[PDB]
RNA sequence: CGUAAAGCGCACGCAGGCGGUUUGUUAAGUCAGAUGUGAAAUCCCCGGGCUCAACCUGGGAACUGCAUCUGAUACUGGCAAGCUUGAGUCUCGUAGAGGGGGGUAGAAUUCCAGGUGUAGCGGUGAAAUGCGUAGAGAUCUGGAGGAAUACCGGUGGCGAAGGCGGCCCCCUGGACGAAGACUGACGCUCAGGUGCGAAAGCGUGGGGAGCAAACAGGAUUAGAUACCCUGGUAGUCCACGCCGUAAACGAUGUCGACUUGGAGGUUGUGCCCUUGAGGCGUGGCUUCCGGAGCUAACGCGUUAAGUCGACCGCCUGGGGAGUA
């Protein structure tokens, strides 16, 4: 029930941009700014704002270029049926490295991108493109 | 089945505030209460199988409630089924 | 903007969700359309007709409904552009290679029949080349004049002719759809909200485009 | 994994796996730097040496690892303290072929006894079997039984599933809605385990109207161990045990989130005018058609076969064989 609420963070994008949506809310919890907080930083998702003192329920903006969604693809990776952690110099790209990929590291989440270059590495969440 | 007044006793004397509808304690005495009294109708009846799975399904949810209790308060735990005659 | 009665909002109980922006909601289970984000709409619907247009276009305005046919008649040869208002033959464009050659049937006949060949044979016999000139003019009549392809293809709805949205949209024409509330407007161009099932609004469009096409023609 | 191979028939549920949200903490997992060990040849890189090659060979890299030191603390886990959405308890109603027990009423069926009354009755495509002058069939009067509940009755309702239907009473399960109350993650699933589980069948003992395997007789046929007809045992019915299989089939595992509409049906509840069969919301369940999308197509389509996440079961050519 509801175990994975990232999975679910995720998966409400890829349905909002399906139907053209504008903005899309969820349960927010700290975690999930943290994702939304990269996730806007480099532009695939507009504005994201939470209203909230008992019922915290971000309400995340999507974007387009066209009609056609921005986030071509969204892939919650680390389950929690396997948790997936990549090293500094094993971590991948996606999309020949142009496509973003969220990793957590012990300085916060943030983009594999970054991350690479602050030396380090972690738990790979899920990527964009 | 074990109707309003009969319901308030069970609080009255599980009670830490009069309304206290939800605790634990006051549930599993309740299950107790109408399991015991519901083995009063399936002592005779026992071909009565449909009403069972309902009774199966108070017991055992019963025992969920316990074991919440007991890693969450043994003294609440080992106060209760020393006075609710538990444990077979 | 609100130049007209009869524009303002119709058609049904069962609209279509990618209808959802330009909506209000009244009695009898009917949608009224915001006007108000359809006339900024059109504005550059009617611009951007026009920009062509002085290109020396070569403009569409197909009709059906025996309701709408006549204003479009009125509108298209009003001084220019074609116009076709009976049963469109699906397929003048997509395959006008092979329409282009029945004008050769029409037009001889179009001149044959009042100063040329109509009566070398029997009367009834005869008669038969005419109703094909009538036929021929009946259907084919309105494009007669075109020639090539299209550089536009106005319409006044999108599903009564959803051959065309399919067709048009397919070489690439440029469409300028009156879509009701109740069609999809996917495929057109410029989807212009309206009312299809009015008179008195759709002749307000043709009137609408009858303005600026009568300025492109440069 | 709807139909191709393949979702257990269904349910409770231990181990196991997975887990909402807030802060502190810990540093197990994770992670960075370092350290030691990771034998050589072999593999790879720039060379070099035999005329070249194969072959030899110097040096490096690598040997995807393991242990320890030092830290980083996002995420995960442990621990401590919370919080309310998840989950569960209470207050009050509502609907229901839910289940068990105990009564009961009408209709018909056959039987049996009387009155009446007389040659057929029954049956079939057409017959015959059979029943009848020891008097049927028909009709009337009455009694005895057994089993089923017309009409209502409806792609209605209820139940986990199998399944469940005249009325009445007692016992008893589940569901749904209101405005609040209250515990405060107590969750989701679950091999093995336990229980349930149509029909037919088995065992002991009651019943036995009708129906009727088997069987008997008459027919049909080329033959007819059948299709038809007259009868008819078990059986079906009740109790207690047993069996546990079925095209136990929406051929669709369970839980949860999300994702354009249309039209009915059923059942709660808020409001406006009940001012007149209404009009406008808000919830549960349910029926057909349908869009994006999905699929091999057929079709599914907010109750998905769509979009994901947790857990289980199951498939891996046909026959052999679901057998030994």
Redesign the pocket.
């Given at each position: 029930?509801?175990?994975?609420?990232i999975?679910?963070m995720?998966?409400?994008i890829?349905?909002?941009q399906?139907?053209n949506?504008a903005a899309?809310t969820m349960?927010s919890?700290?975690?999930?700014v943290?994702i939304a907080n990269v996730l806007k930083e480099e532009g695939f998702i507009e504005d994201f704002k939470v209203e909230g003192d008992?019922?915290p329920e971000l309400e995340l903006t999507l974007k387009y270029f066209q009609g056609k969604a921005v986030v071509e693809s969204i892939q919650?990776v680390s389950?929690?049926?396997?948790?997936i952690?990549?090293?500094?110099?094993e971590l991948p790209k996606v999309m020949a490295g142009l496509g973003i990929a969220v990793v957590?590291?012990?300085?916060?989440?943030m983009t594999d991108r970054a991350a690479r270059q602050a030396?380090?590495?972690?738990?790979i969440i899920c990527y964009v493109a | 089945?074990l109707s309003?007044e009969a319901?308030a006793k069970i609080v009255s004397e599980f009670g830490r505030?009069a309304?206290?509808?939800?605790?634990?304690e006051?549930?599993v005495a309740?299950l107790t209460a109408?399991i015991n009294?519901?083995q009063?109708?399936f002592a005779e009846?026992?071909?009565?199988?449909?009403?069972?799975?309902?009774?199966?399904?108070?017991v055992?949810?019963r025992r969920?409630?316990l074991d919440?209790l007991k890693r969450?308060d043994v003294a609440r735990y080992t106060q209760l089924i020393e006075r609710l005659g538990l444990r077979r | 903007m609100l130049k007209a009665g009869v524009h303002f909002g119709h058609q049904t109980?069962?609209?279509n969700?990618?209808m959802?922006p330009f909506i209000f909601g009244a009695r009898n289970?009917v949608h009224i359309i915001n006007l108000e984000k359809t006339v900024p709409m059109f504005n550059e619907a009617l611009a951007e007709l026009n920009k062509i247009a002085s290109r020396k276009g070569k403009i569409l305005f197909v009709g059906t409904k025996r309701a709408a046919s006549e204003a479009v008649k009125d509108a298209a040869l009003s001084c220019d552009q074609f116009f076709v208002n009976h049963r469109w033959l699906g397929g003048m464009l997509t395959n006008w290679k092979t329409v282009r050659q029945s004008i050769k049937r029409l037009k001889d006949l179009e001149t044959q029949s009042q100063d040329g060949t109509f009566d070398k044979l029997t009367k009834k016999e005869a008669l038969m080349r005419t109703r094909e000139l009538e036929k021929l003019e009946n259907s084919l009549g309105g494009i007669k004049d075109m020639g090539g392809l299209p550089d536009a293809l106005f319409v006044i709805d999108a599903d009564h002719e959803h051959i065309a949205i399919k067709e048009a949209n397919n070489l690439g024409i440029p469409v300028f759809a009156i879509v009701d509330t109740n069609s999809d407007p996917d495929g057109v161009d410029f989807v212009i909200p309206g009312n299809d099932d009015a008179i008195r609004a759709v002749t307000l469009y043709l009137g609408a485009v009858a303005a600026t096409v009568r300025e492109g023609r440069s």
């Amino acid at each position: 029930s509801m175990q994975d609420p990232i999975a679910d963070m995720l998966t409400r994008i890829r349905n909002g941009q399906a139907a053209n949506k504008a903005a899309v809310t969820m349960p927010s919890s700290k975690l999930k700014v943290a994702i939304a907080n990269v996730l806007k930083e480099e532009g695939f998702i507009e504005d994201f704002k939470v209203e909230g003192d008992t019922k915290p329920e971000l309400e995340l903006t999507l974007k387009y270029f066209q009609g056609k969604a921005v986030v071509e693809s969204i892939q919650r990776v680390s389950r929690p049926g396997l948790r997936i952690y990549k090293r500094k110099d094993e971590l991948p790209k996606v999309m020949a490295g142009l496509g973003i990929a969220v990793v957590s590291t012990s300085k916060g989440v943030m983009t594999d991108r970054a991350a690479r270059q602050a030396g380090l590495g972690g738990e790979i969440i899920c990527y964009v493109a | 089945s074990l109707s309003t007044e009969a319901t308030a006793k069970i609080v009255s004397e599980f009670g830490r505030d009069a309304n206290d509808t939800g605790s634990t304690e006051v549930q599993v005495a309740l299950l107790t209460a109408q399991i015991n009294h519901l083995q009063g109708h399936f002592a005779e009846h026992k071909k009565d199988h449909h009403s069972r799975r309902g009774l199966l399904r108070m017991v055992s949810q019963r025992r969920k409630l316990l074991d919440y209790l007991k890693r969450k308060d043994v003294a609440r735990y080992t106060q209760l089924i020393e006075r609710l005659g538990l444990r077979r | 903007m609100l130049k007209a009665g009869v524009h303002f909002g119709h058609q049904t109980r069962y609209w279509n969700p990618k209808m959802k922006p330009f909506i209000f909601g009244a009695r009898n289970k009917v949608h009224i359309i915001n006007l108000e984000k359809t006339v900024p709409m059109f504005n550059e619907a009617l611009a951007e007709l026009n920009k062509i247009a002085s290109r020396k276009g070569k403009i569409l305005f197909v009709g059906t409904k025996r309701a709408a046919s006549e204003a479009v008649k009125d509108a298209a040869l009003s001084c220019d552009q074609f116009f076709v208002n009976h049963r469109w033959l699906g397929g003048m464009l997509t395959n006008w290679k092979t329409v282009r050659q029945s004008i050769k049937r029409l037009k001889d006949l179009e001149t044959q029949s009042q100063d040329g060949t109509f009566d070398k044979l029997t009367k009834k016999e005869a008669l038969m080349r005419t109703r094909e000139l009538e036929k021929l003019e009946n259907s084919l009549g309105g494009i007669k004049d075109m020639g090539g392809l299209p550089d536009a293809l106005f319409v006044i709805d999108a599903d009564h002719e959803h051959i065309a949205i399919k067709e048009a949209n397919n070489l690439g024409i440029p469409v300028f759809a009156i879509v009701d509330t109740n069609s999809d407007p996917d495929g057109v161009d410029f989807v212009i909200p309206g009312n299809d099932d009015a008179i008195r609004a759709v002749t307000l469009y043709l009137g609408a485009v009858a303005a600026t096409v009568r300025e492109g023609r440069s």
